[PDB]
Design a protein around this ligand. Structure first.
Ligand code: HEM
Length: 419
Protein backbone atom coordinates (compact mmCIF):
# COMPACT_ATOMS: atom_id res chain seq x y z
CA UNK A 1 0.00 0.00 0.00
CA UNK A 2 1.67 3.12 -1.38
CA UNK A 3 1.98 6.42 0.44
CA UNK A 4 2.19 10.07 -0.43
CA UNK A 5 4.33 10.45 2.70
CA UNK A 6 4.10 13.21 5.28
CA UNK A 7 2.59 13.97 8.65
CA UNK A 8 -0.21 15.96 7.05
CA UNK A 9 -0.60 16.68 3.39
CA UNK A 10 -3.74 18.86 3.72
CA UNK A 11 -1.90 21.98 2.44
CA UNK A 12 -0.52 19.91 -0.44
CA UNK A 13 -4.06 18.67 -1.20
CA UNK A 14 -5.22 22.33 -1.20
CA UNK A 15 -2.34 23.42 -3.41
CA UNK A 16 -3.17 20.75 -6.06
CA UNK A 17 -6.96 20.84 -5.57
CA UNK A 18 -8.97 18.70 -7.96
CA UNK A 19 -5.84 17.12 -9.47
CA UNK A 20 -4.13 16.06 -6.22
CA UNK A 21 -5.39 12.54 -6.37
CA UNK A 22 -4.58 12.07 -10.02
CA UNK A 23 -1.09 13.46 -9.57
CA UNK A 24 -0.45 10.96 -6.78
CA UNK A 25 -1.69 7.97 -8.79
CA UNK A 26 0.51 9.01 -11.75
CA UNK A 27 3.62 9.57 -9.61
CA UNK A 28 3.27 6.48 -7.35
CA UNK A 29 2.18 4.54 -10.46
CA UNK A 30 -0.84 2.90 -8.85
CA UNK A 31 -4.62 2.99 -8.56
CA UNK A 32 -4.88 3.30 -4.76
CA UNK A 33 -2.75 5.11 -2.22
CA UNK A 34 -2.73 6.46 1.30
CA UNK A 35 -2.20 9.98 2.47
CA UNK A 36 -2.52 11.58 5.88
CA UNK A 37 -4.73 14.66 6.02
CA UNK A 38 -7.11 16.60 8.32
CA UNK A 39 -4.77 16.25 11.35
CA UNK A 40 -2.58 13.18 10.77
CA UNK A 41 -5.52 10.89 9.91
CA UNK A 42 -4.61 8.29 7.28
CA UNK A 43 -6.99 8.07 4.28
CA UNK A 44 -6.95 5.53 1.46
CA UNK A 45 -7.99 7.18 -1.82
CA UNK A 46 -10.00 4.80 -4.05
CA UNK A 47 -11.20 5.49 -7.51
CA UNK A 48 -13.11 4.28 -10.54
CA UNK A 49 -16.11 1.98 -10.72
CA UNK A 50 -14.52 -0.52 -8.49
CA UNK A 51 -13.64 2.11 -5.92
CA UNK A 52 -17.17 3.46 -6.07
CA UNK A 53 -18.75 0.00 -5.57
CA UNK A 54 -16.69 -0.79 -2.55
CA UNK A 55 -17.11 2.72 -1.04
CA UNK A 56 -20.88 2.23 -1.08
CA UNK A 57 -20.78 -1.27 0.37
CA UNK A 58 -22.42 -0.66 3.74
CA UNK A 59 -21.17 -3.97 5.26
CA UNK A 60 -17.64 -2.67 5.00
CA UNK A 61 -17.70 1.17 4.94
CA UNK A 62 -18.81 3.60 7.67
CA UNK A 63 -19.72 7.28 6.81
CA UNK A 64 -20.94 8.44 10.25
CA UNK A 65 -18.42 10.70 12.01
CA UNK A 66 -16.11 11.12 9.00
CA UNK A 67 -16.94 14.62 7.74
CA UNK A 68 -14.62 17.22 9.35
CA UNK A 69 -16.52 19.12 12.08
CA UNK A 70 -16.06 22.53 10.53
CA UNK A 71 -17.78 21.34 7.38
CA UNK A 72 -20.63 19.84 9.35
CA UNK A 73 -20.90 23.16 11.20
CA UNK A 74 -21.15 25.21 7.98
CA UNK A 75 -22.22 23.24 4.95
CA UNK A 76 -24.61 20.55 6.15
CA UNK A 77 -25.53 21.42 9.71
CA UNK A 78 -25.30 19.42 12.96
CA UNK A 79 -27.44 16.32 13.10
CA UNK A 80 -28.04 16.52 9.32
CA UNK A 81 -28.82 13.45 7.22
CA UNK A 82 -25.25 13.45 5.88
CA UNK A 83 -24.02 12.62 9.44
CA UNK A 84 -26.13 9.57 10.34
CA UNK A 85 -25.88 5.88 9.27
CA UNK A 86 -27.84 2.61 9.39
CA UNK A 87 -31.54 2.50 10.20
CA UNK A 88 -31.86 6.09 11.29
CA UNK A 89 -30.41 7.06 7.91
CA UNK A 90 -32.61 4.83 5.73
CA UNK A 91 -35.68 6.13 7.51
CA UNK A 92 -34.87 9.82 7.03
CA UNK A 93 -33.48 9.32 3.52
CA UNK A 94 -36.86 7.89 2.56
CA UNK A 95 -38.41 11.23 3.58
CA UNK A 96 -36.09 13.13 1.28
CA UNK A 97 -36.84 10.74 -1.65
CA UNK A 98 -40.59 10.97 -1.06
CA UNK A 99 -40.32 14.55 -2.27
CA UNK A 100 -39.05 13.37 -5.65
CA UNK A 101 -42.28 12.32 -7.25
CA UNK A 102 -43.12 12.90 -10.90
CA UNK A 103 -45.38 15.86 -10.11
CA UNK A 104 -42.91 17.59 -7.82
CA UNK A 105 -40.21 17.06 -10.45
CA UNK A 106 -42.33 18.68 -13.19
CA UNK A 107 -43.10 21.51 -10.80
CA UNK A 108 -39.44 22.36 -10.40
CA UNK A 109 -39.10 22.31 -14.22
CA UNK A 110 -42.02 24.71 -14.67
CA UNK A 111 -40.96 27.05 -11.89
CA UNK A 112 -37.43 27.19 -13.41
CA UNK A 113 -38.65 27.87 -16.91
CA UNK A 114 -41.21 30.46 -15.70
CA UNK A 115 -38.70 32.40 -13.65
CA UNK A 116 -36.11 32.57 -16.48
CA UNK A 117 -38.72 33.60 -19.03
CA UNK A 118 -39.96 36.22 -16.51
CA UNK A 119 -36.44 37.50 -15.86
CA UNK A 120 -35.57 38.53 -19.41
CA UNK A 121 -36.51 42.18 -19.19
CA UNK A 122 -34.48 42.64 -16.04
CA UNK A 123 -31.34 41.16 -17.68
CA UNK A 124 -31.94 43.29 -20.82
CA UNK A 125 -31.87 46.27 -18.50
CA UNK A 126 -28.49 45.62 -16.92
CA UNK A 127 -25.14 46.81 -18.33
CA UNK A 128 -23.68 43.45 -17.46
CA UNK A 129 -25.11 40.34 -15.93
CA UNK A 130 -22.90 38.16 -13.77
CA UNK A 131 -24.48 34.70 -14.34
CA UNK A 132 -23.14 33.19 -11.15
CA UNK A 133 -24.95 35.84 -9.12
CA UNK A 134 -28.01 36.11 -11.30
CA UNK A 135 -28.59 32.41 -11.26
CA UNK A 136 -28.08 32.04 -7.46
CA UNK A 137 -30.77 34.70 -6.88
CA UNK A 138 -33.18 33.13 -9.37
CA UNK A 139 -32.63 29.63 -7.97
CA UNK A 140 -33.20 30.99 -4.49
CA UNK A 141 -36.71 31.89 -5.65
CA UNK A 142 -37.14 28.43 -7.29
CA UNK A 143 -35.80 26.62 -4.26
CA UNK A 144 -37.73 28.36 -1.52
CA UNK A 145 -40.97 27.98 -3.43
CA UNK A 146 -40.37 24.39 -4.38
CA UNK A 147 -39.70 23.60 -0.70
CA UNK A 148 -43.01 25.35 0.34
CA UNK A 149 -41.15 28.04 2.32
CA UNK A 150 -42.44 31.56 1.53
CA UNK A 151 -39.53 34.01 1.16
CA UNK A 152 -40.61 37.55 0.21
CA UNK A 153 -38.93 39.30 -2.81
CA UNK A 154 -37.36 41.74 -0.33
CA UNK A 155 -35.40 38.96 1.41
CA UNK A 156 -34.19 36.88 -1.49
CA UNK A 157 -30.90 38.69 -2.04
CA UNK A 158 -29.97 38.27 1.64
CA UNK A 159 -30.86 34.58 1.63
CA UNK A 160 -29.00 33.97 -1.65
CA UNK A 161 -25.86 35.53 -0.25
CA UNK A 162 -26.07 33.48 2.97
CA UNK A 163 -26.46 30.28 0.94
CA UNK A 164 -23.55 31.22 -1.31
CA UNK A 165 -21.24 31.47 1.72
CA UNK A 166 -22.40 28.19 3.15
CA UNK A 167 -22.01 26.29 -0.14
CA UNK A 168 -18.43 27.65 -0.52
CA UNK A 169 -17.43 26.55 2.97
CA UNK A 170 -15.80 23.25 2.00
CA UNK A 171 -12.87 25.27 0.47
CA UNK A 172 -10.42 24.51 3.37
CA UNK A 173 -11.44 20.84 3.68
CA UNK A 174 -12.44 21.43 7.29
CA UNK A 175 -9.42 23.56 8.34
CA UNK A 176 -9.52 27.13 9.75
CA UNK A 177 -10.02 29.93 7.14
CA UNK A 178 -10.93 33.61 7.55
CA UNK A 179 -14.52 33.19 6.24
CA UNK A 180 -15.35 30.40 8.71
CA UNK A 181 -17.08 32.51 11.30
CA UNK A 182 -19.10 34.41 8.67
CA UNK A 183 -20.17 31.00 7.26
CA UNK A 184 -21.43 29.90 10.72
CA UNK A 185 -23.45 33.12 11.15
CA UNK A 186 -24.95 32.76 7.74
CA UNK A 187 -25.98 29.26 8.75
CA UNK A 188 -27.39 30.43 12.04
CA UNK A 189 -29.64 33.10 10.32
CA UNK A 190 -30.88 30.56 7.82
CA UNK A 191 -31.50 27.87 10.43
CA UNK A 192 -33.32 30.36 12.76
CA UNK A 193 -35.63 31.47 9.99
CA UNK A 194 -36.45 27.89 8.88
CA UNK A 195 -36.96 26.73 12.45
CA UNK A 196 -39.57 29.46 12.92
CA UNK A 197 -41.41 28.21 9.82
CA UNK A 198 -41.37 24.66 11.17
CA UNK A 199 -42.58 25.69 14.60
CA UNK A 200 -45.32 27.87 13.11
CA UNK A 201 -46.38 25.11 10.69
CA UNK A 202 -46.55 22.72 13.63
CA UNK A 203 -48.68 25.14 15.61
CA UNK A 204 -51.15 25.48 12.69
CA UNK A 205 -50.35 29.23 12.08
CA UNK A 206 -49.09 28.78 8.53
CA UNK A 207 -50.22 26.24 5.97
CA UNK A 208 -47.61 25.03 3.49
CA UNK A 209 -49.02 22.82 0.76
CA UNK A 210 -49.06 19.08 1.32
CA UNK A 211 -46.24 17.35 -0.56
CA UNK A 212 -43.82 20.18 0.01
CA UNK A 213 -40.64 19.91 1.99
CA UNK A 214 -41.84 22.28 4.68
CA UNK A 215 -45.05 20.27 5.19
CA UNK A 216 -43.59 16.82 4.92
CA UNK A 217 -40.62 17.67 7.17
CA UNK A 218 -42.63 19.47 9.82
CA UNK A 219 -45.16 16.60 10.25
CA UNK A 220 -42.86 13.61 9.65
CA UNK A 221 -42.15 11.13 12.41
CA UNK A 222 -39.18 8.74 12.44
CA UNK A 223 -39.27 4.93 12.78
CA UNK A 224 -39.65 5.22 16.56
CA UNK A 225 -42.69 7.49 16.16
CA UNK A 226 -40.80 10.71 17.12
CA UNK A 227 -40.80 13.96 15.16
CA UNK A 228 -37.44 15.60 14.40
CA UNK A 229 -36.60 18.27 17.03
CA UNK A 230 -37.29 21.72 15.58
CA UNK A 231 -33.70 22.81 14.87
CA UNK A 232 -32.72 19.46 13.42
CA UNK A 233 -35.82 19.55 11.30
CA UNK A 234 -34.69 23.05 10.12
CA UNK A 235 -31.25 21.75 9.28
CA UNK A 236 -32.69 18.99 7.18
CA UNK A 237 -35.22 21.21 5.46
CA UNK A 238 -32.43 23.48 4.35
CA UNK A 239 -30.70 20.37 2.98
CA UNK A 240 -33.64 20.15 0.65
CA UNK A 241 -32.94 23.39 -1.20
CA UNK A 242 -29.60 24.97 -0.31
CA UNK A 243 -28.07 22.46 -2.75
CA UNK A 244 -30.71 23.35 -5.34
CA UNK A 245 -29.43 26.92 -5.02
CA UNK A 246 -25.89 25.55 -5.42
CA UNK A 247 -26.83 24.52 -8.96
CA UNK A 248 -25.82 28.11 -9.72
CA UNK A 249 -22.31 26.72 -9.94
CA UNK A 250 -23.35 24.46 -12.82
CA UNK A 251 -25.31 27.24 -14.55
CA UNK A 252 -22.10 29.27 -14.72
CA UNK A 253 -20.07 26.31 -15.94
CA UNK A 254 -22.83 25.49 -18.43
CA UNK A 255 -22.59 28.90 -20.03
CA UNK A 256 -18.74 28.57 -20.03
CA UNK A 257 -19.02 25.27 -21.91
CA UNK A 258 -21.54 26.63 -24.44
CA UNK A 259 -19.35 29.68 -25.03
CA UNK A 260 -16.19 27.55 -25.60
CA UNK A 261 -18.07 25.02 -27.72
CA UNK A 262 -20.62 27.10 -29.73
CA UNK A 263 -21.67 23.97 -31.59
CA UNK A 264 -23.40 22.70 -28.41
CA UNK A 265 -25.62 25.73 -28.57
CA UNK A 266 -27.04 24.94 -32.01
CA UNK A 267 -27.68 21.37 -30.94
CA UNK A 268 -29.47 22.46 -27.84
CA UNK A 269 -31.95 24.23 -30.18
CA UNK A 270 -32.04 21.58 -32.95
CA UNK A 271 -32.23 18.29 -31.01
CA UNK A 272 -34.77 17.65 -28.18
CA UNK A 273 -32.74 14.85 -26.52
CA UNK A 274 -29.65 17.04 -26.38
CA UNK A 275 -30.29 19.38 -23.44
CA UNK A 276 -30.18 16.24 -21.23
CA UNK A 277 -26.77 15.21 -22.58
CA UNK A 278 -25.38 18.66 -22.20
CA UNK A 279 -26.56 18.82 -18.59
CA UNK A 280 -24.97 15.44 -17.80
CA UNK A 281 -21.66 16.44 -19.36
CA UNK A 282 -21.58 19.65 -17.36
CA UNK A 283 -21.84 17.52 -14.15
CA UNK A 284 -19.21 15.00 -15.32
CA UNK A 285 -16.73 17.47 -16.80
CA UNK A 286 -16.58 20.45 -14.44
CA UNK A 287 -15.21 20.31 -10.87
CA UNK A 288 -17.33 20.63 -7.78
CA UNK A 289 -17.08 17.72 -5.35
CA UNK A 290 -13.47 16.56 -5.02
CA UNK A 291 -13.91 13.48 -2.86
CA UNK A 292 -15.95 11.90 -0.04
CA UNK A 293 -14.79 10.56 3.35
CA UNK A 294 -15.66 7.21 4.90
CA UNK A 295 -14.00 4.61 7.12
CA UNK A 296 -13.15 0.90 6.87
CA UNK A 297 -15.13 -1.20 9.36
CA UNK A 298 -13.14 -4.35 8.74
CA UNK A 299 -10.01 -5.20 6.76
CA UNK A 300 -10.81 -4.80 3.06
CA UNK A 301 -8.86 -6.52 0.27
CA UNK A 302 -9.01 -4.16 -2.68
CA UNK A 303 -7.04 -3.92 -5.94
CA UNK A 304 -4.30 -6.18 -4.66
CA UNK A 305 -3.75 -4.50 -1.27
CA UNK A 306 -5.48 -4.83 2.10
CA UNK A 307 -7.13 -1.76 3.62
CA UNK A 308 -6.91 -2.22 7.41
CA UNK A 309 -9.82 -1.82 9.76
CA UNK A 310 -10.08 1.74 11.12
CA UNK A 311 -8.29 3.60 8.29
CA UNK A 312 -9.96 6.50 6.50
CA UNK A 313 -11.32 6.05 2.91
CA UNK A 314 -11.77 8.76 0.30
CA UNK A 315 -13.78 8.10 -2.82
CA UNK A 316 -12.27 10.20 -5.58
CA UNK A 317 -15.23 11.83 -7.28
CA UNK A 318 -13.25 14.11 -9.60
CA UNK A 319 -10.84 11.29 -10.41
CA UNK A 320 -13.66 8.90 -11.33
CA UNK A 321 -15.59 11.42 -13.46
CA UNK A 322 -12.29 12.01 -15.31
CA UNK A 323 -11.07 8.40 -15.38
CA UNK A 324 -9.69 7.70 -18.89
CA UNK A 325 -10.87 4.06 -18.93
CA UNK A 326 -14.48 5.04 -18.13
CA UNK A 327 -14.67 8.01 -20.41
CA UNK A 328 -13.13 8.28 -23.85
CA UNK A 329 -11.16 11.56 -23.84
CA UNK A 330 -12.14 12.52 -20.25
CA UNK A 331 -10.92 16.12 -20.63
CA UNK A 332 -12.96 16.98 -23.73
CA UNK A 333 -16.45 18.40 -23.34
CA UNK A 334 -18.55 16.04 -25.42
CA UNK A 335 -22.24 15.71 -24.61
CA UNK A 336 -22.69 12.99 -27.24
CA UNK A 337 -20.86 10.53 -24.94
CA UNK A 338 -24.21 10.16 -23.15
CA UNK A 339 -26.07 8.60 -26.09
CA UNK A 340 -24.16 5.40 -25.25
CA UNK A 341 -23.59 5.60 -21.42
CA UNK A 342 -25.48 2.61 -19.83
CA UNK A 343 -26.59 4.47 -16.68
CA UNK A 344 -24.25 2.78 -14.22
CA UNK A 345 -24.56 3.93 -10.60
CA UNK A 346 -20.74 3.87 -10.22
CA UNK A 347 -19.11 5.89 -13.03
CA UNK A 348 -21.01 9.14 -13.33
CA UNK A 349 -20.82 9.97 -9.61
CA UNK A 350 -20.26 13.72 -9.32
CA UNK A 351 -23.18 13.78 -6.85
CA UNK A 352 -22.30 10.43 -5.28
CA UNK A 353 -22.72 6.82 -6.34
CA UNK A 354 -24.48 3.74 -5.06
CA UNK A 355 -28.23 3.50 -4.35
CA UNK A 356 -30.47 6.52 -3.52
CA UNK A 357 -32.34 4.82 -0.64
CA UNK A 358 -29.69 2.76 1.15
CA UNK A 359 -26.61 4.93 0.46
CA UNK A 360 -25.78 8.59 1.05
CA UNK A 361 -26.10 9.26 -2.67
CA UNK A 362 -27.45 12.75 -3.52
CA UNK A 363 -31.23 12.98 -3.21
CA UNK A 364 -31.41 15.76 -5.80
CA UNK A 365 -29.68 14.45 -8.83
CA UNK A 366 -32.93 14.43 -10.85
CA UNK A 367 -33.66 18.04 -9.85
CA UNK A 368 -30.14 18.98 -10.75
CA UNK A 369 -30.46 17.68 -14.30
CA UNK A 370 -33.99 18.96 -14.73
CA UNK A 371 -32.93 22.48 -13.76
CA UNK A 372 -29.85 22.42 -15.95
CA UNK A 373 -31.88 21.35 -18.95
CA UNK A 374 -34.39 24.19 -18.63
CA UNK A 375 -31.74 26.77 -17.85
CA UNK A 376 -29.43 25.86 -20.78
CA UNK A 377 -32.46 25.64 -23.07
CA UNK A 378 -33.28 29.23 -22.08
CA UNK A 379 -29.75 30.58 -22.64
CA UNK A 380 -29.46 28.77 -25.95
CA UNK A 381 -32.82 29.57 -27.54
CA UNK A 382 -34.53 32.49 -25.81
CA UNK A 383 -31.89 35.13 -25.53
CA UNK A 384 -28.87 36.36 -27.38
CA UNK A 385 -26.03 38.04 -25.62
CA UNK A 386 -22.42 39.05 -25.81
CA UNK A 387 -19.49 37.70 -23.77
CA UNK A 388 -16.99 40.49 -23.14
CA UNK A 389 -13.39 39.98 -22.31
CA UNK A 390 -12.99 38.70 -18.78
CA UNK A 391 -11.16 36.03 -16.74
CA UNK A 392 -12.80 32.72 -17.84
CA UNK A 393 -10.26 30.55 -16.08
CA UNK A 394 -11.50 27.46 -14.28
CA UNK A 395 -8.50 26.66 -12.06
CA UNK A 396 -8.41 22.91 -11.40
CA UNK A 397 -5.76 23.51 -8.74
CA UNK A 398 -8.24 25.39 -6.56
CA UNK A 399 -11.17 24.05 -4.57
CA UNK A 400 -14.05 24.86 -5.11
CA UNK A 401 -14.24 24.99 -8.88
CA UNK A 402 -15.38 28.37 -10.23
CA UNK A 403 -15.20 30.47 -13.35
CA UNK A 404 -12.93 33.31 -12.12
CA UNK A 405 -15.27 36.12 -13.37
CA UNK A 406 -18.49 34.21 -12.55
CA UNK A 407 -19.23 34.35 -16.30
CA UNK A 408 -20.36 37.88 -17.23
CA UNK A 409 -22.62 38.62 -20.19
CA UNK A 410 -23.88 41.88 -21.82
CA UNK A 411 -26.36 43.17 -24.38
CA UNK A 412 -28.88 40.56 -23.49
CA UNK A 413 -31.82 40.66 -25.88
CA UNK A 414 -34.83 38.34 -26.11
CA UNK A 415 -35.21 36.18 -29.24
CA UNK A 416 -38.66 36.94 -30.68
CA UNK A 417 -39.99 36.41 -34.20
CA UNK A 418 -42.15 39.50 -34.73
CA UNK A 419 -43.12 38.76 -38.36
C1 HEM B 1 -24.92 21.73 -6.84
C2 HEM B 1 -25.32 20.52 -7.19
C3 HEM B 1 -25.18 19.36 -6.20
C4 HEM B 1 -24.08 18.67 -5.96
C5 HEM B 1 -22.67 18.92 -6.58
C6 HEM B 1 -24.43 17.63 -4.99
C7 HEM B 1 -23.59 16.66 -4.51
C8 HEM B 1 -23.90 15.78 -3.50
C9 HEM B 1 -22.97 14.82 -2.91
C10 HEM B 1 -21.52 14.51 -3.32
C11 HEM B 1 -23.61 14.21 -1.93
C12 HEM B 1 -22.99 13.10 -1.01
C13 HEM B 1 -22.99 11.68 -1.62
C14 HEM B 1 -22.40 10.75 -0.59
O1 HEM B 1 -22.16 11.16 0.56
O2 HEM B 1 -22.13 9.57 -0.87
C15 HEM B 1 -24.93 14.79 -1.85
C16 HEM B 1 -25.86 14.41 -0.97
C17 HEM B 1 -27.07 14.96 -0.85
N1 HEM B 1 -27.65 15.80 -1.76
FE1 HEM B 1 -26.73 16.69 -3.25
N2 HEM B 1 -25.77 17.71 -4.72
C18 HEM B 1 -26.25 18.76 -5.44
C19 HEM B 1 -27.56 19.14 -5.48
C20 HEM B 1 -28.56 18.70 -4.65
C21 HEM B 1 -29.98 19.05 -4.72
C22 HEM B 1 -30.65 19.98 -5.72
C23 HEM B 1 -30.57 18.45 -3.71
C24 HEM B 1 -32.04 18.50 -3.30
C25 HEM B 1 -32.91 19.26 -3.92
C26 HEM B 1 -29.58 17.68 -3.00
C27 HEM B 1 -29.81 16.94 -1.88
C28 HEM B 1 -28.89 16.17 -1.26
C29 HEM B 1 -29.14 15.51 -0.01
C30 HEM B 1 -30.38 15.57 0.87
C31 HEM B 1 -27.94 14.69 0.27
C32 HEM B 1 -27.68 13.80 1.50
C33 HEM B 1 -28.09 12.38 1.12
C34 HEM B 1 -27.86 11.38 2.21
O3 HEM B 1 -27.04 11.69 3.14
O4 HEM B 1 -28.48 10.27 2.09
N3 HEM B 1 -28.39 17.84 -3.60
N4 HEM B 1 -25.10 15.70 -2.84
Amino acid sequence: LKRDKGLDNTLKVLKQGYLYTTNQRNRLNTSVFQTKALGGKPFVVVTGKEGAEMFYNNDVVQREGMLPKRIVNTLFGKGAIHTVDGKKHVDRKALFMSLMTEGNLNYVRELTRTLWHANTQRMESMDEVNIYRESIVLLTKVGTRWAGVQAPPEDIERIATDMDIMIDSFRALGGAFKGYKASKEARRRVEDWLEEQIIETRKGNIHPPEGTALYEFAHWEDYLGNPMDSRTCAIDLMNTFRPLIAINRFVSFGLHAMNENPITREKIKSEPDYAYKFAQEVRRYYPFVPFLPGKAKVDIDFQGVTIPAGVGLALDVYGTTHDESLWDDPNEFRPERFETWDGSPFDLIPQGGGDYWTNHRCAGEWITVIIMEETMKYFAEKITYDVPEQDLEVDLNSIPGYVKSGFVIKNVREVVDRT
